[PDB]
Coordinates of all heavy atoms in Angstrom, one line a residue:
Chain B
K38 N 91.9 95.6 121.1 CA 91.1 96.4 122.0 C 92.0 97.3 122.9 O 91.6 98.5 123.0 CB 90.2 95.5 122.8 CG 89.3 96.2 123.8 CD 88.4 95.3 124.6 CE 89.0 95.0 126.0 NZ 88.0 94.2 126.8
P39 N 93.0 96.8 123.5 CA 93.8 97.7 124.4 C 94.4 98.8 123.6 O 94.5 99.9 124.1 CB 94.9 96.7 124.9 CG 94.3 95.4 124.8 CD 93.5 95.4 123.6
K40 N 94.9 98.6 122.3 CA 95.5 99.6 121.5 C 94.5 100.7 121.2 O 94.8 101.9 121.3 CB 96.1 99.1 120.3 CG 97.1 100.0 119.6 CD 97.8 99.3 118.5 CE 97.6 100.0 117.1 NZ 98.8 99.8 116.2
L41 N 93.3 100.3 120.8 CA 92.2 101.3 120.5 C 91.8 102.0 121.7 O 91.6 103.3 121.6 CB 91.0 100.6 119.8 CG 91.3 99.8 118.5 CD1 90.2 98.8 118.2 CD2 91.4 100.8 117.4
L42 N 91.7 101.4 122.8 CA 91.3 102.0 124.1 C 92.4 103.1 124.5 O 92.0 104.2 124.9 CB 91.1 101.0 125.2 CG 89.8 100.2 125.1 CD1 89.4 99.8 126.6 CD2 88.7 101.0 124.4
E43 N 93.7 102.7 124.3 CA 94.7 103.7 124.7 C 94.7 104.8 123.7 O 94.9 106.0 124.1 CB 96.1 103.0 124.6 CG 96.4 102.2 125.9 CD 97.6 102.8 126.7 OE1 98.4 103.5 126.0 OE2 97.6 102.6 127.9
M44 N 94.5 104.6 122.4 CA 94.4 105.7 121.4 C 93.3 106.6 121.7 O 93.4 107.8 121.6 CB 94.3 105.1 120.0 CG 94.9 106.0 118.9 SD 95.3 105.1 117.4 CE 95.9 103.5 118.1
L45 N 92.1 106.1 122.0 CA 90.9 106.9 122.3 C 91.0 107.7 123.6 O 90.6 108.8 123.7 CB 89.6 106.1 122.2 CG 89.1 105.8 120.8 CD1 87.6 105.6 120.9 CD2 89.4 107.0 119.9
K46 N 91.6 107.0 124.6 CA 91.7 107.6 126.0 C 93.0 108.4 126.2 O 93.3 108.8 127.3 CB 91.6 106.5 127.0 CG 90.2 105.9 127.2 CD 90.1 105.1 128.5 CE 88.6 104.7 128.7 NZ 88.0 105.3 129.9
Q47 N 93.8 108.5 125.1 CA 95.1 109.2 125.3 C 94.8 110.7 125.6 O 93.8 111.3 125.2 CB 95.9 109.1 124.0 CG 95.4 110.1 122.9 CD 96.1 109.7 121.5 OE1 97.2 109.1 121.5 NE2 95.5 110.1 120.4
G48 N 95.7 111.3 126.4 CA 95.5 112.7 126.8 C 95.8 113.6 125.7 O 96.4 113.3 124.7
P49 N 95.2 114.8 125.8 CA 95.4 115.8 124.8 C 96.8 116.3 124.6 O 97.6 116.2 125.6 CB 94.5 117.0 125.2 CG 94.4 116.8 126.7 CD 94.4 115.3 126.9
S50 N 97.2 116.6 123.4 CA 98.6 117.1 123.2 C 98.9 118.4 123.9 O 98.0 119.2 124.2 CB 98.8 117.2 121.7 OG 98.5 118.6 121.3
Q51 N 100.1 118.6 124.3 CA 100.5 119.7 125.1 C 100.3 121.0 124.3 O 100.1 122.1 125.0 CB 102.0 119.6 125.5 CG 102.3 118.5 126.5 CD 103.8 118.4 126.8 OE1 104.6 118.8 126.0 NE2 104.1 117.8 127.9
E52 N 100.3 121.0 123.0 CA 100.1 122.2 122.2 C 98.8 122.9 122.5 O 98.7 124.1 122.8 CB 100.3 122.0 120.8 CG 101.7 121.5 120.4 CD 101.9 120.0 120.4 OE1 101.3 119.3 121.3 OE2 102.6 119.5 119.5
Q53 N 97.7 122.1 122.3 CA 96.4 122.7 122.5 C 96.1 123.0 124.0 O 95.3 123.9 124.3 CB 95.3 121.9 121.9 CG 95.1 120.5 122.5 CD 95.6 119.4 121.6 OE1 96.3 119.6 120.6 NE2 95.3 118.1 122.0
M54 N 96.7 122.3 124.9 CA 96.6 122.6 126.3 C 97.2 124.0 126.6 O 96.6 124.8 127.3 CB 97.2 121.5 127.2 CG 96.6 120.1 127.0 SD 96.8 119.1 128.4 CE 98.5 119.5 128.9
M55 N 98.4 124.2 126.0 CA 99.0 125.5 126.2 C 98.2 126.6 125.5 O 98.1 127.7 126.1 CB 100.4 125.5 125.5 CG 101.5 125.1 126.5 SD 103.1 125.7 126.0 CE 104.1 124.2 125.9
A56 N 97.6 126.3 124.4 CA 96.7 127.3 123.7 C 95.5 127.6 124.6 O 95.2 128.8 124.7 CB 96.3 126.8 122.3
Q57 N 94.9 126.6 125.2 CA 93.8 126.9 126.1 C 94.2 127.7 127.3 O 93.5 128.6 127.7 CB 93.1 125.6 126.5 CG 91.7 125.7 127.1 CD 90.8 126.5 126.3 OE1 90.0 127.3 126.8 NE2 90.8 126.3 124.9
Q58 N 95.3 127.4 127.9 CA 95.8 128.1 129.1 C 96.1 129.6 128.7 O 95.8 130.5 129.5 CB 97.0 127.4 129.7 CG 98.3 127.8 129.2 CD 99.5 127.0 129.9 OE1 100.1 126.2 129.3 NE2 99.7 127.4 131.2
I59 N 96.7 129.8 127.5 CA 97.0 131.2 127.1 C 95.7 131.9 126.8 O 95.6 133.1 127.1 CB 97.9 131.2 125.9 CG1 99.2 130.5 126.2 CG2 98.1 132.6 125.4 CD1 100.3 130.7 125.2
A60 N 94.6 131.2 126.3 CA 93.4 131.9 126.1 C 92.7 132.3 127.4 O 92.2 133.4 127.5 CB 92.4 130.9 125.3
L61 N 92.8 131.4 128.4 CA 92.3 131.7 129.7 C 93.1 132.9 130.3 O 92.5 133.8 130.9 CB 92.4 130.5 130.6 CG 91.2 129.6 130.7 CD1 90.0 130.2 131.5 CD2 90.7 129.2 129.3
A62 N 94.4 132.9 130.2 CA 95.2 134.0 130.7 C 94.8 135.3 130.0 O 94.8 136.4 130.6 CB 96.7 133.7 130.5
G63 N 94.6 135.3 128.7 CA 94.2 136.4 127.9 C 92.8 137.0 128.4 O 92.6 138.2 128.4
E64 N 91.9 136.1 128.6 CA 90.6 136.5 129.2 C 90.8 137.2 130.5 O 90.1 138.2 130.8 CB 89.7 135.3 129.2 CG 89.2 134.7 127.9 CD 88.1 133.7 128.0 OE1 87.8 133.3 129.1 OE2 87.6 133.3 127.0
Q65 N 91.6 136.6 131.4 CA 91.8 137.2 132.7 C 92.5 138.6 132.5 O 92.1 139.5 133.2 CB 92.7 136.3 133.5 CG 92.5 136.4 135.1 CD 91.1 136.6 135.5 OE1 90.2 136.1 134.9 NE2 90.9 137.3 136.6
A66 N 93.5 138.7 131.6 CA 94.1 140.0 131.4 C 93.1 141.0 130.8 O 93.2 142.2 131.2 CB 95.3 139.8 130.4
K67 N 92.2 140.6 130.0 CA 91.2 141.5 129.4 C 90.3 142.0 130.6 O 89.9 143.2 130.6 CB 90.4 140.8 128.4 CG 90.9 141.0 126.9 CD 89.8 141.0 125.9 CE 90.3 141.3 124.5 NZ 89.4 142.2 123.7
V68 N 89.9 141.1 131.5 CA 89.1 141.5 132.6 C 89.8 142.5 133.5 O 89.3 143.5 134.0 CB 88.7 140.2 133.4 CG1 88.0 140.6 134.7 CG2 87.7 139.4 132.6
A69 N 91.1 142.2 133.7 CA 91.9 143.1 134.5 C 92.0 144.5 133.9 O 92.0 145.5 134.5 CB 93.3 142.5 134.8
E70 N 92.2 144.5 132.5 CA 92.3 145.8 131.8 C 91.0 146.5 131.9 O 91.0 147.8 132.1 CB 92.7 145.5 130.4 CG 92.0 146.4 129.4 CD 92.7 146.5 128.0 OE1 93.7 145.8 127.9 OE2 92.2 147.2 127.1
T71 N 89.9 145.8 131.8 CA 88.6 146.4 132.0 C 88.4 147.1 133.4 O 87.9 148.2 133.5 CB 87.5 145.4 131.8 OG1 87.5 145.0 130.4 CG2 86.2 146.0 132.2
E72 N 88.8 146.3 134.4 CA 88.7 146.9 135.8 C 89.5 148.1 136.0 O 89.1 149.1 136.6 CB 89.0 145.8 136.8 CG 88.2 144.5 136.7 CD 88.9 143.3 137.3 OE1 90.1 143.2 137.3 OE2 88.2 142.5 137.9
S73 N 90.8 148.1 135.4 CA 91.6 149.2 135.5 C 91.1 150.4 134.8 O 91.2 151.6 135.2 CB 93.0 148.9 135.0 OG 93.0 148.1 133.9
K74 N 90.5 150.2 133.6 CA 89.9 151.2 132.8 C 88.7 151.8 133.6 O 88.5 153.1 133.6 CB 89.4 150.7 131.5 CG 90.2 151.2 130.3 CD 89.6 150.9 129.0 CE 90.6 150.5 127.9 NZ 90.0 150.2 126.6
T75 N 87.9 151.0 134.2 CA 86.8 151.5 135.0 C 87.3 152.4 136.2 O 86.7 153.4 136.5 CB 85.9 150.4 135.5 OG1 85.9 149.3 134.6 CG2 84.5 150.8 135.8
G76 N 88.3 151.9 136.9 CA 88.9 152.7 137.9 C 89.5 154.0 137.4 O 89.3 155.1 138.1
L77 N 90.1 154.0 136.2 CA 90.6 155.2 135.6 C 89.4 156.2 135.3 O 89.6 157.4 135.5 CB 91.4 154.9 134.4 CG 91.7 155.9 133.3 CD1 92.2 157.3 133.8 CD2 92.6 155.4 132.2
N78 N 88.3 155.7 134.8 CA 87.2 156.5 134.5 C 86.6 157.1 135.8 O 86.2 158.3 135.8 CB 86.1 155.7 133.8 CG 85.5 156.4 132.6 OD1 86.2 157.3 132.0 ND2 84.3 156.1 132.2
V79 N 86.5 156.3 136.8 CA 86.0 156.8 138.1 C 86.9 158.0 138.6 O 86.5 159.0 139.1 CB 85.9 155.7 139.1 CG1 85.6 156.3 140.5 CG2 84.7 154.8 138.7
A80 N 88.3 157.7 138.5 CA 89.2 158.8 139.0 C 89.1 160.0 138.1 O 89.2 161.1 138.7 CB 90.6 158.2 138.9
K81 N 88.9 159.9 136.8 CA 88.7 161.0 136.0 C 87.4 161.8 136.3 O 87.4 163.0 136.3 CB 88.6 160.6 134.5 CG 89.7 161.3 133.6 CD 90.3 160.3 132.6 CE 91.1 161.1 131.6 NZ 91.8 160.1 130.6
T82 N 86.3 161.1 136.7 CA 85.1 161.7 137.1 C 85.4 162.5 138.4 O 84.9 163.6 138.6 CB 84.0 160.7 137.3 OG1 83.8 160.0 136.1 CG2 82.7 161.4 137.7
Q83 N 86.1 161.9 139.3 CA 86.4 162.6 140.6 C 87.3 163.8 140.3 O 87.1 164.8 141.0 CB 87.1 161.6 141.6 CG 86.2 160.6 142.1 CD 86.6 160.2 143.6 OE1 87.5 160.7 144.1 NE2 85.8 159.3 144.2
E84 N 88.2 163.7 139.4 CA 89.1 164.9 139.1 C 88.2 166.0 138.5 O 88.4 167.2 138.8 CB 90.2 164.4 138.1 CG 90.9 165.6 137.5 CD 90.6 165.7 136.0 OE1 89.8 164.9 135.5 OE2 91.3 166.5 135.3
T85 N 87.3 165.6 137.6 CA 86.4 166.7 137.0 C 85.6 167.3 138.1 O 85.4 168.5 138.1 CB 85.5 166.0 135.9 OG1 86.4 165.4 134.9 CG2 84.7 167.1 135.3

Side-chain angles (χ1 to χ4, degrees):
Chain B
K38 179 179 102 172
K40 195 172 123 152
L41 299 163
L42 284 211
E43 279 248 332
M44 207 159 324
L45 277 207
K46 289 195 175 244
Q47 79 192 338
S50 91
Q51 293 177 335
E52 296 94 320
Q53 63 254 10
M54 301 206 319
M55 271 204 234
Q57 193 54 220
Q58 89 180 109
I59 300 189
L61 271 283
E64 292 189 351
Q65 207 43 30
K67 268 210 177 219
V68 169
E70 144 161 358
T71 291
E72 305 157 324
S73 43
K74 251 191 217 179
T75 325
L77 158 49
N78 224 27
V79 167
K81 235 140 172 180
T82 304
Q83 288 215 359
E84 166 248 6
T85 304

